[PDB]
Each structure stands twice: as structure tokens, then as C-alpha cells.
Amino acid sequence: MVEFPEGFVWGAATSGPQTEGNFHKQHQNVFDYWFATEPEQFDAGVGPDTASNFYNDYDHDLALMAQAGVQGLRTSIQWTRLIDDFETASLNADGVAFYNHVIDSMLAHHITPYINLHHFDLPVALYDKYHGWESKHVVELFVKFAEQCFKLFGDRVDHWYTFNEPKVVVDGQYLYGWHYPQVINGPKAVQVAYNMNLASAKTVARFHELSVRPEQQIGIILNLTPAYAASDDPADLAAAEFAELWSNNLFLDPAVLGHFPEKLVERLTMDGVLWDATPTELAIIAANPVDSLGVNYYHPFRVQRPDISPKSLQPWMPDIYFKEYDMPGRMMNVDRGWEIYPQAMTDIARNIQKNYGNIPWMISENGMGVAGEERFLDKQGVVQDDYRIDFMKEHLTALAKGIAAGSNCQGYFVWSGIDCWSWNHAYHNRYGLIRNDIHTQTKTLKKSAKWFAELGERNGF
Amino acid sequence: MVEFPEGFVWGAATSGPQTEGNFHKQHQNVFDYWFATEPEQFDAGVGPDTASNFYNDYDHDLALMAQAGVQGLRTSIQWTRLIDDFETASLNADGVAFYNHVIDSMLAHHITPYINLHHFDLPVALYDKYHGWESKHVVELFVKFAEQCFKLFGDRVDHWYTFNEPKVVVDGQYLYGWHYPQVINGPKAVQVAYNMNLASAKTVARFHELSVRPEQQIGIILNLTPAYAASDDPADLAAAEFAELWSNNLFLDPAVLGHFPEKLVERLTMDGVLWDATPTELAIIAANPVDSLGVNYYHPFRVQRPDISPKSLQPWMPDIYFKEYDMPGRMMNVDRGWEIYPQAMTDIARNIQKNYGNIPWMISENGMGVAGEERFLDKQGVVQDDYRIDFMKEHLTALAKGIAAGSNCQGYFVWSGIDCWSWNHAYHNRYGLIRNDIHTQTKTLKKSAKWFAELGERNGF
């Protein structure tokens, strides 16, 4: 009734920081330090020190994911676990040993590894010493960490990603207080977006200098969620224009086309907040676009005119040009606060096909987070998460229309395999096909896990 | 300068609930349920779910305890981990295998096991089903649990304990709200004190039926701090008399002499709150005294006359006869609010010598808790806990005065080897010879750890 291309990958996505726990980890990332000093900023004071116990229980957790139909698992390597000295990227022997264990264990459970290098987990010491992603020297230290990952694990990992959602690092660390250091500074944010695009292009370049087999490829993972104008009012259309350039093109265009979006550069310049770039850096970005795209999609983005004129006396923010809009009658993931709009999948697919060379891409994250899932347990402690199955069906239906129209989508990864630690929200909302009882770290397939395994067997539903 | 008997045992003490974490544990004990229910009752919301990670890191943790001079480790087996069906004491095979690994690992590190059966960790389902320690049926199920421990581990463990401080279970669960379920009921407390005494004698009986070697002994661990009278004013001395019959004789006399203190039975009968016993139960108590005594001491205990007459119209509580007294001029550990009075050790040693047959005994707990020990890290990472060393010097010196005068003391167990979870206080105070960074579960010897090691080799200081 709804079928998918031959070879389509059915996978799951997590990250190191949200699964491993902090057991024996050498360095604190910014979230580790945030929790150590202000535990009250986290749901129930549950931080990342244990998370979903993946450091200790990886082998059996991978077996459960394989049970759940996870043919590919995408997670991340922590800079703060792998590296001893950041300046030279010397190696923490115990951390290298741990990532070889989980990659080997993925293979033994017949899971294809997809390895992302960075997922919101900047080392706090590099923020204290250089201001983190503001520093083009920190950019270089990142590339040297990437180089080690490629040399250590490239022999049995084909599929890599530089970053998960750099835009969330920019927004979170420098615009809205979501991430420690909670800086609130538009111009810095512009430089950080620049610096992270540059780090990604420099990592792509080093990846291909070091690759040995043709099937090795490196990509990036972004939100491509479209900006719908609230109305056809010119002021709402103009707000949606800028929201689109700034939330999507800022990263999509340099990663895939090789250059920054022309209209955005012009607006940033006119406002006096343009990044500092050099011709040599821009040439690196132009010469090393990603091999593939990971699309994270959860909810649409709707936007109307700003309440006050953008020429008002205020600190510069991208938000001076647009304000978020609530559509009456929207479908809502309420205990979460997000709109549910599957059709955006189709728009994204068409946009990639028409405007971005129909580059090979995957849905790298799609999922629904729900609170208090103990209420939906049945007589055997199996969460009856039909809502999650229906949510997956609605978005997969939309995806398949994009594919039949000709968009080069090659896989679908659910967020997430096993309930994992959702930053300051901790375990308030669950996303997994597999429930984790975090008091005992005992995990059990949900109803959606068996549906997912069957979806992969029939390559459809 | 201050020496100790040949063959003195230099040890450390903990418990399972305070170290293991709840990783893969089948059942919740009362503290597990309490934290799952009311995490706000726990410092910083830090519960038992990870504790000091002993479930995962036992082998290396025992190595560090060996470096710190721990020749005997006293800890406990968790009823809620070992047993599948409480009614039949059927075995949980992963919990059985876990205790087999730590006991074997203790042996390989040249650490003599000291295994205690119960440290405040009643399974909450047995309180729901039967009201817990109020049930003489639960008394039997505990004996069945002890049976299983002796058969699985008795081939390698010589030294056993029935309970760690039953009085704290009485006081905590039924008098002052320290332990879930926080019942406030004096008469119920009297019956629970009786039932736990009876559980212990029955366990001692079973233990000797199933004994295989003569070296195998089993004891009980109690607080025997004297109840010092505030003055020689007859109301004060009479208060100290009941305080001692109640806080010490309630368990000392059944455990060692095989009967309850006659003046205490008389008092509770007069007030109409006395336990329900049978002659056969009393005969089992009389026929199975303990083989040895573990003594816990931290701080002294002083009492004065109650403020109102004990005949006043109020719910019966042991405290209607005595009130805590603060002595002008006391030597205090001010941050912890505890008096320092080392000679109480010497008084305890004399009491066991004179009145309790000089039964073989050890100091099963003694130690000092301090908050924010990060203040005394040298930048080599070692806590400079000179205060802990001086504390041990004073108390070992007073204990030596007792051994010299003829007290049959055989060992000194520090609380604790590694920093562990102190119930609702969690990790606010640290007692260890070894420091635990509970964010990373990375452990490091303190200064006192090297001191304790040299103390054991020199057998003095």
C-alpha cells in the first residue's frame, strides 16, 4: 500500500552525550559542566552522568535495537571522551577502546554504523580558553579530532557526518539560552555559524584526503524545516523570506552548493554583523561540499511580521525580522508543544530535488516525544505507543510521495532507538522504540519496535 | 607508640544499597521506592540508582580498596537483588552471578569478605503485602533468604552478620520518619524491634545448621554508645537508665545473653505496649546467641529528664522518659553538629569486657563525614583529609586503652572505603578513604588512604 525503494535504509538515531553516561570520561563538555554547577536547570536534577547507561550495556542494547528492526544506527563520538590533549589531539586510550567496542559490536549485530562527530558537546575547557566556536583555532582542533576518528575507525565505518544540527549550537549557545554558556549575542552568533560551516568543510576535505574505499562518504545533518508565512500580507511574506534564508540556507547552501546565500550576506552586511571570512577559507568551503545530506524534521516553522520595526533601537538578533506564528486548527504534539505537519516531508524532498542537485539524502531524524508512557503499559510492561506508529505512518506516507516524485531519499532514521537523555528535559518526554526504565536501566521493546521490524521486512506498510 | 594485638583486622565497611546502583535489580527496596516516589526527599535529587557504581566497577574498586589497606571489606547482599520469589526465596540468576563475582574478586585482591544480610533495605512489596517487619511471616521469608545466601556463598565466606543496626530500622520506619514508609507509632515500633531480634536468632540457628567449617561465625552489628546522664539529679540518672535499656539493651541482651532486659520488659508491660512473643520464639532467642559483635560508634549520646511527666496524655513513645542533652563545653565538629568524645570507645570496650562475657568483637563502623572536600584537593588530585586522620588517631588511641585493659577487640573497620550514598543525605557528606567523583564515577585515594595502609602494615602509629 505504501512501498519504498530497494535498498532503503531503516535506522535509528541517538548521540553519545545522551546515551553513554559520563563513566570514566576524561573531560566535561558544556552540558556536563552545566549540570555539575546548576543541576536545578535539568528536569528533576537528572543530568547526563548515567543517561541510558550505554557505556556499560552497549552489547545488549545493540541486540535490542537489532530486535527492533534497526538496520543502521547513527550515534556520535564525544570529543571529550576520545581526546586526551585537545591541542595535539592525543588519544585517551580507554576512550578509543570504548568506541572500537561499540563499532565492533554494531557489526556483530549486523547494524551498519553511521558515525557523527559532534552533537552539542563542545569541551567546556575550550570555551573557557578560547570562547569555543568563536575561535578559528578551536575549528582547527576540531579537524584534528576528526582526523583521528577517521584513522581509528575508518577501516570499518563507511558513513560519516561532521555535525548534528550546527544551527542548534548557534541558537543554543549564543542566541536563546538553550545551551551553556547561554550567551545572548547576535553578532557572535553570526561568526559562530560561519566558523562551524568552515569546520565542516575543513573536515570534509581531510576526510577525502584520508579515504581508501569508494563507498566511504561524509555528510552533514541539518533542520530543513520550511518557513510558512502566516498570510500573504507583504510583511508576513518578507518575514518568511528572511526566516528561510537564516534558518535553512545559512547551512544548506555552503554545505551543498559551496557558497553562502547571496541575499543573506547582503542583509548581514547592511546590518553590520557580517562574519569575518578570508578568501582562503571561502575557497575551502567552495571546494569541499558534503557527499550527502541528513534531514532532521519534526515540526513546521510558521512566521509573521515582527511586532516592532527592525529599525528600532535594539540589539541585533535574527529575530528582529520575524516572529513565530501559531496557526488555528494546527495538529499538536501537546505534551511537548510542537505542531504535527507531515506534508513538510514532501516539500523538503521536492526542494532538495529541484534546488540542491537531488543530492543523496536521508531522513536522519523523525520522532515523537511523549510524557508519562507508564500509563500506556499493558500486562507485560509493553508500551502501547500506537500514537508513535500512526505518527510514523503519516510522515512516511508524505516521504513516499516525495520519492515517487523523484527525490533521491535513501533512508529513514527514527529518533530514537532507546529512550535517551533529552538535555534539560532529561527523560520527561520519551522518543524511543525501546523504553528505558532509568532507575534500573532495564529496557523493553515498545509496540512500535515490532511494527518497525516488520516495516523493514516488507520495505513498506 | 600506640600498638595493636597480633592479627588485628584493619577493614572498611559499606552496604549494597549505598554502593551498587540499581542496575538490573529485580525489586525495589523501601529506599528505591521512596526515591522513585519522592526524589525531593533526597539531597539534590541524587538517589540510589547509580550510587558509587559498584555493580559495574567492583573489580577495580576492590583493587583501590586494597591499595588503601583494606584487609577485610564488610558490605551487604540485597534481598531485592538476590531473590526472585520472596515467598519461596527462588533465585535471580543475574543477582546470584553478581555476588559470586564480587566475592571472587574480593578473594583475588586478598580482601577477606565480611557479608551482612540486611542494611535497611526491606523490599517495598513485602511492606505493601504484609506491613513488612511487623509480620512474623516476613521474618520467615527473611530466614529463607538468608538460607539461600549461606548455601551459595558459604563455601568462601567465613564472617557473616544478620543485621546492620536493627534499631535504625525501628527508629526510621516506625518512630521518627527517617525511612520510608515513615510510620509514627510507638507500640508498632516495640513489636518490630521484637520481630527483628527474633529474625536474627532464627538466622543464627539456620546458619549453624548449615555450617561446614568451624571458622564460620555469624554476628550482629549494633550501636552501643553509652547514654550519659546530664547530671546526678535523680530524674536525669533515671532518664539515662531507660535510654540505655532501650537504645542498647533492647538488642545487646537478646543477641548476646539470649534474653530481654528484665527492667525493660517490666516498663513496656506497665505501659501496655509490650510485644507479642511466644515461649518457643523466646526459646529460639535463648538458644541462638550471636558468635561476635560489631560495634558502630560516631558520636556520644547524652540525655536529661523529660520536660513533662511521662504520665501526661500523649501517644506512647520511648522518648517520654528522656530528652537529648547538649553539654556546655562539649568538643564539637561544628559543620556536622556532632560532639567529639573518643573515650566513649573505651567505655564500650569495658562494658563488653565486664558484662557481656568479653565476647569477641570488632569496631564495625567508625568515621567522619565532611562536605565539599574539593576544597582540600592538592592539584595532584588527592584530598588532603588530615582531619580524617586525626579523627582516626584519637579514636584508635581510646580503643587501644580498652584492648590494653583486657577487652576482646579484634578489628577496626572504617566507614567508609569509598565515598558512598548516605540515604537522603546522598553525597553531601563524604566518609571514604577513597574519593568518588560521582559525575564520572572516577575514584582516587585520599591522604588518609595511604595513612591507613601504613597503619595496617605497622599495626600501629
Query: Which residue type sits at B5?
Result: P
Closest partner CB to A36 (pick from B24, B39, B439) = B439
**Strand pairing partners for A303?**
A229, A324
Q: Enumerate residues 6+ apart whose C-beta is below 8 A from B17.
A: B29, B31, B48, B51, B76, B78, B119, B120, B121, B421
As a whole number of angstroms, the distance between CA A137 and CA A129 comes to 11
Instruction: Using an 8 Å CB-CB cutoff, list chain B residues near A39.
Output: 44-45
- Tell me if residue A398 falls in helix, strand or coil: helix
Q: How far apart are the first and last CA of chain A?
A: 6
Closest partner CB to B441 (pick from A23, A32, A44) = A23
Instruction: Using an 8 Å CB-CB cutoff, list chain B residues near A45.
Output: 39, 44-46
Measured in angstroms, the CA of B46 and the nearest CA of chain A are apart by 8
- For A27, name the nearest residue in chain B, comparing CA atoms only: B440
C-beta separation of A446 from A433 below 8 A? yes
Could you tell me the residue range of the domain that residue B194 belongs to? Answer: 1-461
Set of cell numbers at residue B2: 600506640
As a whole number of angstroms, the distance between CA B382 and CA B281 comes to 52
3-class DSSP string for chain B: CCECCCCCEEEEECCCCCCCCCCCCCCCEHHHHHHHHCHHHCHHHCCCCCCCCHHHHHHHHHHHHHHCCCCEEEEECCHHHHECCCCCCCECHHHHHHHHHHHHHHHHCCCEEEEECCCCCCEHHHHHHHCHHHCHHHHHHHHHHHHHHHHHHCCCCCEEEEEECHHHHHHHHHCCCCCCCCCCCHHHHHHHHHHHHHHHHHHHHHHHHCCCCCCCEEEEEEECCCCEECCCCHHHHHHHHHHHHHHHHHHHHHHHHCCCCHHHHHHHHHCCCCCCCCHHHHHHHHHCCCCCEEEECCCCCEEECCCCCCCCCCCCCHHHHCEECCCCCCCEECCCCEECCCCHHHHHHHHHHHHCCCCCEEEEECCCCEECHHHHECCCCCECCHHHHHHHHHHHHHHHHHHHCCCCEEEEEECCCECCCCHHHCCCEECCCEEEECCCCEEEECHHHHHHHHHHHHCEC
- Tell me if residue A318 falls in helix, strand or coil: helix
Measured in angstroms, the CA of B55 and the nearest CA of chain A are apart by 10
- Tell me if residue A113 falls in helix, strand or coil: strand
Report how far apart, in Å, the C-alpha atoms of B217 and of each of B118, B223, B438 are. 17, 20, 35
Entry field: residues in chain B: 461
C-beta separation of B51 from B18 below 8 A? yes
> CA nearest A319: which of A131, A184, A458?
A184
As a whole number of angstroms, the distance between CA B444 and CA B263 comes to 50
Entry field: residues in chain A: 461
Q: How far apart are the first and last CA of chain B?
A: 6
C-beta separation of B101 from B62 below 8 A? no
Cβ of B23 and A49 within 8 Å? no
Closest partner CB to B25 (pick from A36, A46, A440) = A440
Total number of domains constituting chain B: 1
Instruction: Using an 8 Å CB-CB cutoff, list chain B residues near A381.
Output: none
- Tell me if residue A405 falls in helix, strand or coil: coil
B290: domain CATH number?
3.20.20.80
Set of cell numbers at residue B222: 549494633
- Residue B373 known to be catalytic: no
The bridge status of strand B302-304 relative to strand B293-296 is unpaired
Instruction: Using an 8 Å CB-CB cutoff, list chain A residues near B441.
Output: 22-24, 49
Query: Which residue type sits at A227?
Result: A
Breaks in chain B (C–N > 2.5 Å) following residue? none
> CA nearest A143: which of A222, A200, A99?
A200
Set of cell numbers at residue B203: 538466622
- Tell me if residue A442 falls in helix, strand or coil: strand
Catalytic residue among B134, B165, B244, B281: B165
Resolution given for this structure, in angstroms: 2.3
* Residue the block writes with cell 553538629: B337
As a whole number of angstroms, the distance between CA B40 and CA B42 comes to 5
Q: Enumerate residues 6+ apart whose C-beta is below 8 A from B432.
A: B416, B417, B418, B419, B420, B446
B442 touches chain A (CB under 8 A): yes
Instruction: Using an 8 Å CB-CB cutoff, list chain B residues near A46.
Output: 45
DSSP A230: S
Closest partner CB to A45 (pick from B45, B439, B441) = B45
A53 touches chain B (CB under 8 A): yes
> CA nearest A71: which of A149, A13, A1?
A13
- Tell me if residue A321 falls in helix, strand or coil: helix
> CA nearest A370: which of A355, A381, A386?
A386
